[PDB]
């Protein structure tokens, strides 16, 4: 500013001007920013930042790219000076700074916060994770305007932070002025005094990208409305140590090639795909084909239909599994936790809060009470697994009573009232209170759960283990003796691309099946209104396992076969 600029600033500002003259994608974007501001001023705003694609910076200039990657304190400045000069040159109407933003691959600079150490301080760091806290928005002091009343005129003295600079200049304080030159009092004016607001958020590692690391981000005025706890985020900042990161770019959030799409398109029309895909998930567990068929239909999902001008419809499916404790029910949760897209498993007993969803805490920093999010609020589209369902208390039962029908949750507590809506298909595993169970005992009191929870859960799978000499001969040689990265790509491509719709060929057979069962009410199991919804959810599932654009009659037939196995 006051100092004379050397050739080290002029060469970098002419190189950024040559890069902006070569690529007009930012020039027309800032012209669009200015014409949008002019249209809003003519009617009477956008927070003045342009995202720069880094892929055009590597092939254009190698040294400029290396200087941005190793010295942003000496490289960012002249680029924003070039951007402000381009904003002044692109506008010709009469009459503020402008900032920058980046995107793209970083290489070794993109890392986990637990691996973020004292190395590469000055260099810019791209780090992803989950946010834990978002502080209160606080305005700062810059340029207060004072009015001296006896002579009648204005004075103004401005301040400077010691972080928002990404570089170097002389630093010193200044008393908030209370008396102008000589002996006379002067008044403050805040009408024109700027109050740039700042925020202080905390972000730690996502549990998948870590062998725990949490850091602090100081936030400017511009991006203060795009942060909230519970969402996966990726921040881009500078690791300054007066240790914190000066976050300039925030992005709230397996790779697919063209060879894998040929394989999943080749496996889309064969009518033997479903049975071998259900048999290929767990080879260490003998038997239970229809249970893992429902588990395959469970982890792929539904459709999540949102009705017009009304409440949303549940797309998630829920499964409860009971039986003797001898089999692999506790060994299947580790497989579904390690092979899904994102999954959260809890023990069902031992939650420090009031349950999974949340908890209250006191903080002496603010001297107030904050909210802690224990579980179900983190996974919003994935799956959650609860083993030992009978040991879970009534508070979490009242919460999942809301969870099931809601595919959401609600909380009203001392000083807050709200509702949360994150998708979270549940996988519950329970044990009886008698320890063992056989066919001759009644199937209702052995469950040790209320009838409302039987109506909440869609598929109740009973696994029997009475000793039989015929079937028990090959378990020892089977455990004494398609792949994992393929079904993940299969499930996510089905989840992102194809949405199935209904046909007349699959409405009548499911109407016939629901009216025929509404038999079970006199013989073995109650029938509810919800079950109608769960009888087509599964059909849609099968129809999207084959990734067809609409449903078929065989999807309702395999849903009825799953019903006959899980009900009788």
């Amino acid at each position: 500013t006051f100092f004379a600029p050397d050739a080290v600033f002029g060469d970098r500002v002419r190189r950024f001007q040559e890069f902006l003259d070569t690529f007009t994608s930012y020039r027309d974007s800032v012209r669009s920013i200015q014409v949008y501001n002019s249209n809003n001023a003519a009617n009477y705003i956008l927070p003045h930042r342009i995202i720069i694609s880094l892929d055009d910076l590597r092939e254009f200039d190698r040294s400029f790219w290396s200087g941005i990657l190793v010295e942003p304190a000496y490289f960012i400045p002249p680029a924003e000076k070039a951007l402000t000069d381009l904003a002044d040159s692109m506008d010709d109407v009469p009459h503020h700074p402008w900032k920058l933003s980046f995107k793209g691959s970083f290489g070794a600079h993109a890392l986990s916060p637990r691996t973020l150490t004292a190395q590469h301080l000055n260099k810019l760091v791209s780090v992803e994770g989950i946010v834990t806290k978002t502080s209160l928005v606080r305005p700062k002091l810059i340029r207060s305007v004072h009015y001296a009343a006896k002579t009648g005129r204005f004075h103004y003295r401005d301040y400077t932070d010691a972080t928002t600079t990404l570089t170097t200049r002389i630093p010193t304080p200044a008393i908030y002025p209370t008396e102008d030159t000589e002996g006379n009092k002067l008044t403050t004016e805040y009408g024109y005094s700027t109050f740039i607001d700042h925020q202080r958020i905390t972000v730690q590692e996502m549990p998948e990208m870590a062998p725990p690391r949490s850091i602090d981000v100081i936030l400017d005025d511009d991006l203060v409305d795009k942060t909230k706890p519970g969402d996966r985020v990726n921040v881009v900042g500078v690791f300054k140590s007066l240790t914190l990161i000066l976050g300039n770019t925030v992005y709230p959030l397996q790779m697919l090639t063209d060879f894998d799409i040929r394989n999943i398109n080749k496996l889309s029309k064969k009518k033997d795909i479903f049975d071998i895909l259900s048999q290929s998930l767990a080879p260490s567990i003998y038997g239970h084909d229809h249970i893992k068929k429902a588990i395959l239909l469970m982890l792929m999902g539904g459709v999540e239909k949102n009705l017009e001008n009304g409440s949303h419809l549940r797309g998630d499916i829920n499964i409860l599994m009971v039986g003797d404790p001898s089999t692999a029910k506790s060994q299947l949760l580790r497989f579904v936790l390690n092979t899904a897209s994102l999954a959260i498993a809890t023990t069902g007993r031992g939650s420090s809060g009031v349950g999974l969803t949340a908890a209250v805490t006191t903080d002496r920093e603010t001297g107030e009470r904050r909210l802690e999010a224990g579980a179900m609020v983190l996974a919003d589209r994935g799956v959650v697994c609860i083993d030992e369902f009978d040991k879970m208390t009534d508070v979490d039962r009242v919460a999942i009573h809301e969870v099931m029908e809601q595919q959401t949750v609600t909380i009203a507590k001392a000083g807050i009232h709200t509702t949360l809506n994150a998708r979270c298909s549940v996988i519950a595993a329970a044990n009886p209170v008698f320890g063992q169970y056989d066919v001759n005992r009644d199937p209702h009191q052995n469950i040790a759960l209320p009838d409302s929870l039987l109506s909440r859960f869609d598929l109740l799978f009973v696994v029997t283990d009475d000793i039989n000499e015929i079937r028990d001969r090959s378990i020892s040689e089977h455990v004494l003796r398609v792949t994992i990265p393929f079904l993940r790509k299969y499930v996510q491509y089905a989840k992102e691309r194809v949405i199935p719709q209904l046909t007349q060929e699959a409405i009548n057979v499911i109407v016939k099946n629901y009216t025929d069962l509404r038999d079970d009410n006199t013989k073995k199991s109650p029938i509810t209104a919800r079950t109608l919804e769960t009888l087509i959810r599964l059909a849609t599932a099968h129809a999207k396992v084959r990734l067809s654009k609409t449903v078929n009659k065989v999807d309702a037939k395999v849903a009825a076969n799953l019903l006959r196995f899980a009900l009788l």
């Binding site: 209160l136 009304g310 409440s311 209104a529």
Partner: protein, 352 residues
């Protein structure tokens, strides 16, 4: 932005009003000269009508409504002197009145923006100094307390009473004499304070909270602080919804508390009751009677007061007993403030 012509526009506005006795602002100055009121309310509708009268006569407008909206703290100390330059004679530091503002409505906004209903999540940071109209519930209120504005000091040696102006939360006692007689003197005699000549103000803090259906998905309704002064001090009773219009340092200026084509096209279709019954929650099957009573439940009814110390309920309470959440969620999503289901405070020492 110039002040020399805008102050002339301000002093020309209060004497040339005929749109809404006679010159109403001079009549209000006669009423404050009669010593019957202490509050001055300035609206932007009169400003808009005076601007229309000045613009239709070919004169220069020199816009006030685009200048009142930014930095109203300078305008409340600048237009006050223009009101102070002219007063009628009475027939029955020297501020007898209190100046306050109020914004224009949306009906005067469509009929030729500045007053939008703002959230506390919609503050962005950069609105510190704009007049804002916030809508929300009030949970925390405080007692009315006298806060000083200027400290009056008296002396027996010189007689010249001095007055200092405080701006912050705290201050220091000026024990040293800064008069015009003690500067040219060896003696620097003791000064005393006056609690009678010092100007006070009825200060009160309040915590506005974010509205329930205006908060986003998953977020919690965070609060904000409003600092009121003067005659507005008893217009805020807790347990209500309010629209507060004030500057953002929150220094409130005006408070209030709780389309024809849209209601007439809903009426003219015929069978209004059955249409409004079958319109809400159409993703379920039948049950027009249960949800018809739910329609009569959310419309509420009439609260009856006998005026002799007895109040009966004007409300309905409906039970839904059934065998093996959507209707309940649709009722809470359509109706406002729908929620799905005392202590002492030591720091400030009160009943929260």
């Amino acid at each position: 932005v110039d002040y020399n012509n805008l102050f002339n526009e301000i002093t020309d506005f209060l004497v040339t009003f005929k749109q809404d006795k006679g010159p109403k602002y001079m009549a209000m100055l006669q009423k404050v000269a009669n010593r019957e009121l202490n509050s001055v309310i300035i609206d932007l509708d009169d400003i808009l009508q005076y601007q229309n009268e000045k613009f239709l006569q070919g004169t220069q407008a020199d816009d006030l409504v685009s200048a009142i909206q930014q930095n109203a703290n300078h305008f409340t100390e600048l237009f006050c002197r223009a009101i102070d330059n002219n007063m009628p004679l009475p027939t029955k530091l020297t501020r007898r009145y209190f100046l306050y503002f109020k914004p224009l409505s949306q009906n005067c906004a469509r009929r030729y923006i500045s007053s939008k209903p703002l959230s506390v999540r919609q503050i962005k940071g950069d609105f510190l100094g704009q007049l804002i109209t916030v809508r929300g519930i009030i949970t925390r209120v405080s007692d009315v307390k006298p806060a000083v504005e200027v400290i009056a000091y008296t002396c027996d040696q010189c007689g010249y009473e001095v007055f200092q102006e405080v701006n912050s939360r705290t201050f220091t006692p000026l024990s040293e004499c800064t008069s015009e007689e003690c500067s040219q003197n060896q003696t620097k005699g003791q000064l005393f304070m006056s609690t009678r000549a010092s100007k006070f103000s009825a200060f009160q803090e309040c915590k506005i909270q974010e509205l329930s259906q205006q908060v986003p998905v998953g977020h919690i309704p965070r609060s904000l602080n409003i600092h009121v002064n003067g005659t507005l001090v008893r217009s805020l009773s807790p347990g209500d919804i309010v629209d507060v219009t004030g500057i953002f340092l929150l220094e409130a200026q005006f408070v209030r508390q709780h389309v024809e084509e849209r209601v007439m096209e809903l009426i003219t279709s015929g069978d209004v009751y059955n249409r409004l019954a079958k319109s809400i929650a159409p993703e379920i099957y039948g049950n027009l009677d249960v949800k018809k009573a739910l329609l009569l439940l959310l419309v509420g009814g009439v609260d009856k007061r006998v005026g002799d110390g007895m109040k009966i309920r004007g409300d309905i309470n409906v039970c839904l007993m059934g065998d093996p959440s959507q209707l309940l969620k649709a009722i809470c999503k359509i109706s406002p403030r729908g929620v799905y289901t005392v202590m002492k405070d030591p720091v400030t020492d009160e009943m929260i």
